[PDB]
Write a protein that binds this ligand. Structure first.
Ligand SMILES: *[C@@H]1O[C@H](CO)[C@@H](O[C@@H]2O[C@H](CO)[C@@H](O[C@@H]3O[C@H](CO)[C@@H](O[C@@H]4O[C@H](CO)[C@@H](O)[C@H](O)[C@H]4NC(C)=O)[C@H](O)[C@H]3NC(C)=O)[C@H](O)[C@H]2NC(C)=O)[C@H](O)[C@H]1NC(C)=O
Ligand SMILES: CCCCCCCCCCCCCCCCCC(=O)OC[C@H](COP(=O)(O)OCCN)OC(=O)CCCCCCCCCCCCCCCCC
Ligand SMILES: CCCCCCCCCCCCCCCCCC(=O)OC[C@H](COP(=O)(O)OCCN)OC(=O)CCCCCCCCCCCCCCCCC
Ligand SMILES: *[C@@H]1O[C@H](CO)[C@@H](O[C@@H]2O[C@H](CO)[C@@H](O[C@@H]3O[C@H](CO)[C@@H](O)[C@H](O)[C@H]3NC(C)=O)[C@H](O)[C@H]2NC(C)=O)[C@H](O)[C@H]1NC(C)=O
Ligand SMILES: *[C@@H]1O[C@H](CO)[C@@H](O[C@@H]2O[C@H](CO)[C@@H](O)[C@H](O)[C@H]2NC(C)=O)[C@H](O)[C@H]1NC(C)=O
Ligand SMILES: *[C@@H]1O[C@H](CO)[C@@H](O[C@@H]2O[C@H](CO)[C@@H](O)[C@H](O)[C@H]2NC(C)=O)[C@H](O)[C@H]1NC(C)=O
Ligand SMILES: *[C@@H]1O[C@H](CO)[C@@H](O[C@@H]2O[C@H](CO)[C@@H](O)[C@H](O)[C@H]2NC(C)=O)[C@H](O)[C@H]1NC(C)=O
Ligand SMILES: [Ca+2]
Ligand SMILES: [Ca+2]
Lengths: 49, 574, 220, 96, 163, 44, 30
């Protein structure tokens, strides 16, 4: 989750507590699509795999 | 001397409500500080409008005026205006006198308005850096491991480039890297001279690095401590400092520091770059245990201030030397920030000596208040070397220990080029002697003798380039040179043969002089040919405008009108 | 986890102790298999966990995606359920309630498919035109987060400035949110049906096409 | 809300640029670079502002906790409260 | 003339383009002339010049400059220009008490050969290479004053003692 | 009225209502269509 | 052109919902 953009992401999976916070935020359903977009761009992007 | 004494008798008043501070802040057309509207006459010796009644103050954009530190500087430096004015009394032909505070504000005299985006910071200027410390032997260690990939890698690339901008020619630099294995980021493989060209290679090479691998401080620091003990090449034999650009880690590499710099000859400055949760503990330990310092660079906006702050640490030995470390130094030929042309700047540091009567504080008294500076224009130096008594082929030229030309016919007021300019003047005009004219096996011998300082001469035959770069003609030349006594400059006079004698016109009668003037009448050109005149400095009353029609009109109407005595118009040229 | 193969001492120590854990689990599996020749639901999981762990370990030792294969490790905490029946019974009670909701799941799948196809018919690549202030396509000079626009003949949003609407744009969310094909449309419909950022899609469509028709789709 | 007031009483203030850690410092202008480009600087004023929803008093804490309990904008408040350092100061990345 | 610049010709089409380098109209003969040592040259770098930009408003650039001059004092020049499957023989005489040279060569159309053109102009470049230039740096002398490693230095403060 | 109904439906869904509350705070200018002291005295 | 009628082609798929007794009864009762 380290892109060139100036604003570093707060909801990442770097540590265990950070992963717990991100998973809880997804479970509450608040801004889960932003995390999904970051995860998609973490891999190749809007391609098949 | 006045800035030191005046600052000693300062009380550091906290607030400034009742007693204001008055000063002309530049680049303008809040409570706690007043303002001054000056007369701003238009004057010669400057291309702009100036005022002799006070000194102007430049405060950088990212520094807030009205803060306690700035408002105190604006008070005790207000006593410098009298010394600024009285200096010009003893030398009317005097250019900018500027005091650059370690706070960040410059107070220059005479007062003129500042010249888009204003990124001028006094502590980054070449004349300030050369007087704040001694030449160094920097060696930048860049951590290119995996953990720095992303944003914090682009922050290291920008920080290294801004770190190289604080180096000069006298300083020696090299950039390395380490990720489980140390290597050089470029082709230099040892310390280089850190001139304009060399820093372009290191800047381009540090932009091509990539982050991948495992961090290894033991191999990186072993590589750095080995490059600083080379002694096989030319170096500065002065301040040795290691600049570590990393984020964080877990190892202190205690065995390496206790092995290489057991006596602590090498300083280690450590930078922690980016937003991260890695441990900054070991990073702060290498700084304290190696006479270094620790800096945090979390964003682009913090790059400029942090990368220039390491000169505070290097200046501590200078202030402890007392008045021994107070010598006037002259910078390379650069372009003035106030649109004045090619200038060289004197330099003298200012110490903080509060409590020197009791000698008890010595806590912040080991930092310099700032650096003084007076600009000497190159056009003034050309005025001391008249060239109209010798051929067009003859000229003067002056060299400095690095080999660059302080004075030369081929030196021109535009920045020197590096590389090929492709698209998708904060650097000095450093032109070597061997690049100002055609190189030869005898020039290098002469150039070497001038650098160390010794008199002599040599008559020899070389091919010389024409004024237009289209022809080469071979002729005889004689170079005669002597070193300037006080300073470290060598002056030479390229005087060819067939010109050891010149025609000196002599006439004490007006009968011949009067009849020669009518030949230069613009209405008399048809019967005598179209006549031009060379716009030379016959006297300051005349004015040179380069159009050559008014000047010829001005010249002929001047010789008849002005009395033949010519009190302030040298008759040798006329 | 570090980016781009970085590591420290703790990661190496953990990768070393993973061998001890693997040998312990393999010994346990061998002992439990010599007792009887695995048919249990929760023992097959342990068996596949241990075999995938051995496969990943031998691949890591031999080749040196390898690392991606050890994502099976996260299934080991689940085995902690099987150890105590007190959690097992409550887990089975939780699972048994999923059977009645299969009809709801099928209904959701059908409505998602229908709405994805309808949105595919309606908004077919229309979210690809934005305003370019610079004379050319360089850095899409439209604020910080550009929005879709429409041409003069269109009914969408026209930037009444010195900029012009020009195609050649990846999309609103880096080209992820759009009805360009079936997969993208289905993902967008699901992200809207979870009621998280459906107004963003609605406003993007309201900018790419007119504002009067497409509210029916999202509201319904 | 009372517990939240005890925890973050005035700690959620921030300056426009992360360099300044107090209100006295947070004055004047500063330079920010567009899209993280070193060659594109812009002067912007320095502002000392509180959170959108803060825990200054009991009513503000109740408003913030209601907006949290509605699951709206709670990650931003959480990550801003994580950085809360000291009663009257600025934020430190992942302080607590 | 002394510099390889045209001043007169015969086809009356060169004479229209007067004051031009001979290498840009007859590269085959120009390259042969510098080989038979009639026209020396020294290549120099100008570090203060302006060049038009390129794909990757004039900025500073390093330009390589070439200047041509007579090699030797000999005045009688004769030889054959072997351009390949052809034969062109010329004679060159240098005017007395003048910096001019007169040459007599066969026509260009006799042989269908045309080598790359020789240009004497402000050719942009970026040399010399500094990777091997630092191996043998020019002699220089640094300042003799040094200030470091003083005993009374405090150094008790770093950026970590504060926090 | 349709836009107000859409905004209220958005708030009922709970999209960014905590932001519309702040965007409806006092201290806002309003449209030139509605007509001295009118700098930003419009918003309750 | 007009694309209102094209959507009708999709609607036939809803007939596939009237095949399972349980789901049809649940939907109708609700
Ligand atoms: C040359 O050296 C001399 C001494 O060697 C130096 O004079 C000293 O200057 C400092 C200012 O940097 C004075 O500091 C006093 O003590 C503290 C230091 O900050 C202040 O108290 C608070 O400090 C906090 C910082 O944590 C600050 O945020 C706060 O605003 C300060 N004020 C409060 C809370 O009211 C004092 O206010 C400050 N001033 C006093 C006590 O008047 C030293 O007192 C100075 N010492 C002497 C002997 O003069 C001088 O500045 C150096 N020259 C230059 C140009 O810096
Ligand atoms: C739980 C259950 C809760 C039920 C809640 C129901 C919510 C319904 C939401 C309705 C929102 C309607 C918003 C809308 O249609 O957008 C406004 C739009 C105005 O469009 P405008 O911007 O003027 O057009 C510019 C063209 N570029 O308006 C229009 O153009 C559309 C016309 C108004 C809508 C009419 C619908 C009622 C039927 C009347 C017959
Ligand atoms: C789950 C648990 C549910 C219960 C949660 C209760 C939440 C109450 C909200 C907290 C009150 C905040 C009061 C406040 O700060 O002032 C509100 C306003 C004054 O404006 P002020 O906030 O000063 O302006 C912006 C300040 N920067 O002053 C006002 O407008 C006063 C009224 C504000 C509070 C209204 C509470 C709504 C209750 C509705 C009841 C529904 C049935 C009727
Ligand atoms: C830093 O700021 C201080 C605050 O204004 C300045 O202090 C003032 O300097 C004035 C110039 O000398 C003083 O005026 C005279 O001071 C002598 C002292 O012996 C006396 O005659 C009188 O006090 C006064 N004369 C008058 C009023 O006719 C101020 O007294 C003095 N203090 C104030 C104004 O509170 C410093 O001068 C200033 N530093 C510098 C370098 O300018
Ligand atoms: C130059 O550096 C080398 C290695 O960095 C120093 O070590 C010498 O290396 C050369 C060839 O490898 C040999 O002379 C010896 O093997 C090494 N020792 C000595 C004393 O020469 C070398 O000392 C440095 N200086 C010189 C003048 O070579
Ligand atoms: C400038 O031109 C001269 C003449 O062409 C060149 O110097 C010659 O270099 C060759 C090298 O093989 C020598 O054999 C000649 O004796 C040199 N001629 C001289 C010194 O007159 C060279 O191109 C330039 N001279 C320099 C660089 O000193
Ligand atoms: C620079 O200073 C030196 C020494 O001060 C000068 O050397 C003088 O040289 C002349 C002739 O060689 C001697 O007659 C003098 O006796 C020397 N000076 C002394 C003090 O002994 C040198 O001339 C000075 N340079 C210039 C340009 O004047
Ligand atoms: Ca939401
Ligand atoms: Ca690392």
């Amino acid at each position: 989750f380290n892109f060139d953009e100036m604003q570093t992401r707060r909801s990442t999976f770097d540590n265990f507590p950070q992963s717990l916070l991100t998973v809880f935020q997804i479970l509450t359903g608040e801004d889960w699509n932003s995390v999904m977009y970051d995860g998609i761009m973490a891999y190749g992007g809007p391609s098949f795999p | 001397l006045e800035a030191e004494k005046v600052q000693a008798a300062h009380q550091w008043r906290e607030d400034f409500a009742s007693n204001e501070v008055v000063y002309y802040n530049a680049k303008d057309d809040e409570p706690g500080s007043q303002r001054i509207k000056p007369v701003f006459i238009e004057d010669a010796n400057f291309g702009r409008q100036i005022s002799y009644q006070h000194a102007a103050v430049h405060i950088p954009t990212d520094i807030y005026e009205g803060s306690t530190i700035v408002l105190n500087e604006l008070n005790w430096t207000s006593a410098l205006d009298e010394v600024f004015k009285k200096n010009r009394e003893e030398d009317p032909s005097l250019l900018w006198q500027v005091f650059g505070s370690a706070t960040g504000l410059a107070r220059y005299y005479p007062a003129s308005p500042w010249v888009k985006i204003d990124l001028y910071d006094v502590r980054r200027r070449p004349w300030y850096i050369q007087g704040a410390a001694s030449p160094k032997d920097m060696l930048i260690l860049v951590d290119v491991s995996g953990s720095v990939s992303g944003l914090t890698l682009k922050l290291i690339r920008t920080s290294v480039s801004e770190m190289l901008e604080t180096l000069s020619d006298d300083d020696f630099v090299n950039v390395a890297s380490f990720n489980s294995n140390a290597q050089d980021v470029s082709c230099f493989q040892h310390l280089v001279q850190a001139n304009v060209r060399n820093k372009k290679v290191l800047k381009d090479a540090v932009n091509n690095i990539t982050a991948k691998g495992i961090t290894d401080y033991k191999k990186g620091f072993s590589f750095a401590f080995e490059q600083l003990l080379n002694y096989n090449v030319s170096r500065a034999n002065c301040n040795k400092i290691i600049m570590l650009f990393t984020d964080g880690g877990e190892e202190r590499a205690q065995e390496i520091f206790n092995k290489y710099n057991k006596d602590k000859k090498v300083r280690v400055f450590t930078f922690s770059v980016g937003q991260h949760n890695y441990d900054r503990g070991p990073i702060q330990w290498m700084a304290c245990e190696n006479k270094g310092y620790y800096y945090e660079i979390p964003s682009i906006g913090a790059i400029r201030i942090n990368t220039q702050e390491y000169l505070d640490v290097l200046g501590r030995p200078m202030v402890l030397a007392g008045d021994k470390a107070k010598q006037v130094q002259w910078t390379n030929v650069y372009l003035d920030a106030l649109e004045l042309g090619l200038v060289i700047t004197g330099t003298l540091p200012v110490f903080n000596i509060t409590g020197q009567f009791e000698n008890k504080t010595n806590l912040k008294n080991q930092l310099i208040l700032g650096v003084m500076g007076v600009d000497v224009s190159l056009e003034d130096i050309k005025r001391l070397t008249p060239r109209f008594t010798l051929c067009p082929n003859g000229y003067y030229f002056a060299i400095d220990p690095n080999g660059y030309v302080l004075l030369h016919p081929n030196l021109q007021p535009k920045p020197i080029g590096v590389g090929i300019p492709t698209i998708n003047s904060q650097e000095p005009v450093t032109l070597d002697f061997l690049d100002a004219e055609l190189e030869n096996d005898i020039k290098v011998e002469i150039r070497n003798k001038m650098i160390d300082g010794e008199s002599g001469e040599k008559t020899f035959r070389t091919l010389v380039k024409s004024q237009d770069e289209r022809y080469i003609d071979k002729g005889n030349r004689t170079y005669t040179w002597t070193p300037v006594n006080g300073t470290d400059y060598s002056l030479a006079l390229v005087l060819p043969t067939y010109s050891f004698y010149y025609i000196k016109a002599k006439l004490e009668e007006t009968i011949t002089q009067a009849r020669y003037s009518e030949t230069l009448k613009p209405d008399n050109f048809e019967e005598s040919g179209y006549t031009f005149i060379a716009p030379r400095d016959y006297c300051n009353d005349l004015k040179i405008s380069d159009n050559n029609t008014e000047f010829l009109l001005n010249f002929n109407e001047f010789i008849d009108r002005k009395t033949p005595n010519n009190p302030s118009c040298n008759a040798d040229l006329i | 986890p570090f980016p781009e193969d970085d590591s420290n001492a703790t990661n190496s120590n953990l990768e070393r102790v993973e061998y001890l854990f693997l040998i312990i689990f393999t010994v346990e599996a061998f002992l439990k298999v010599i007792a009887y020749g695995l048919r249990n639901g929760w023992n097959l999981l342990d068996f596949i966990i241990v075999v995938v762990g051995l496969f990943s370990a031998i691949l890591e030792q031999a080749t040196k995606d390898v690392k991606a294969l050890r994502a099976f490790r996260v299934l080991r905490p689940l085995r902690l359920v099987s150890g105590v029946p007190s959690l097992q019974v409550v887990l089975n009670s939780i699972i048994k309630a999923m059977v009645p909701l299969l009809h709801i799941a099928l209904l959701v799948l059908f409505v998602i498919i229908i709405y994805a196809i309808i949105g595919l018919e309606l908004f077919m690549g229309k979210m690809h035109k934005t305003c370019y202030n610079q004379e050319g396509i360089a850095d899409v000079p439209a604020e910080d987060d550009p929005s879709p626009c429409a041409l003069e003949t269109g009914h969408g949003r026209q930037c009444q400035n010195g900029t012009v609407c020009k195609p050649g744009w990846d999309g609103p969310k880096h080209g992820i949110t759009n009805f360009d094909n079936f997969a993208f449309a289905m993902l967008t419909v699901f992200q809207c049906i979870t009621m998280e950022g459906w107004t963003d899609v609605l406003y993007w469509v309201n900018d790419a096409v007119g504002r009067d028709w497409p509210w029916i789709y999202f509201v319904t | 809300a009372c517990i939240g007031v005890q925890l973050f009483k005035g700690k959620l203030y921030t300056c426009s640029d992360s360099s300044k850690q107090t209100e006295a410092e947070c004055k004047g202008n500063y330079i920010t670079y567009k899209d993280g480009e070193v060659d594109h600087p812009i002067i912007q004023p320095r502002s000392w502002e509180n959170s959108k929803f803060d825990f200054d008093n009991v009513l503000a804490a109740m408003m913030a906790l209601f907006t949290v309990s509605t699951f709206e904008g709670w990650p931003e408040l959480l990550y801003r409260s994580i950085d809360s350092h000291t009663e009257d100061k600025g934020p430190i990345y992942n302080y607590r | 003339d002394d510099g390889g610049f045209l001043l007169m010709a015969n086809h009356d089409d060169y004479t229209n383009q007067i004051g031009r380098f001979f290498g840009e109209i007859d590269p085959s003969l120009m390259r042969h002339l510098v080989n038979i040592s009639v026209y020396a040259f020294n290549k120099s770098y100008d570090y203060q010049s302006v060049c038009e930009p390129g794909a990757a408003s004039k900025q500073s650039c390093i330009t390589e400059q070439t200047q041509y001059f007579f090699d030797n004092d000999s005045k009688s020049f004769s030889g054959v220009l072997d351009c390949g499957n052809c034969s062109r023989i010329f004679h060159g005489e240098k005017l007395m008490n003048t910096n001019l040279i007169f040459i007599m060569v066969e026509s260009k159309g006799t042989c269908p050969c045309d080598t790359r053109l020789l240009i004497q102009a402000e050719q942009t470049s970026d040399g010399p290479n500094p990777c091997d230039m630092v191996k043998q740096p020019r002699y220089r002398k640094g300042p003799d004053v040094c200030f470091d490693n003083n005993v009374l230095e405090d150094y008790t403060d770093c950026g970590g003692v504060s926090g | 009225f349709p836009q107000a109904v859409l905004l209220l439906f958005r708030c009922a869904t709970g999209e960014a209502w905590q932001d519309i509350m702040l965007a409806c705070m006092p201290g806002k200018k309003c449209a030139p269509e509605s007509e001295t002291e009118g700098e930003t005295p419009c918003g309750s | 052109s007009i694309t209102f009628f094209r959507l009708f082609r999709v609607m036939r798929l809803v007939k596939l919902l009237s095949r399972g007794e349980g789901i049809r009864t649940l939907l109708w009762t609700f």
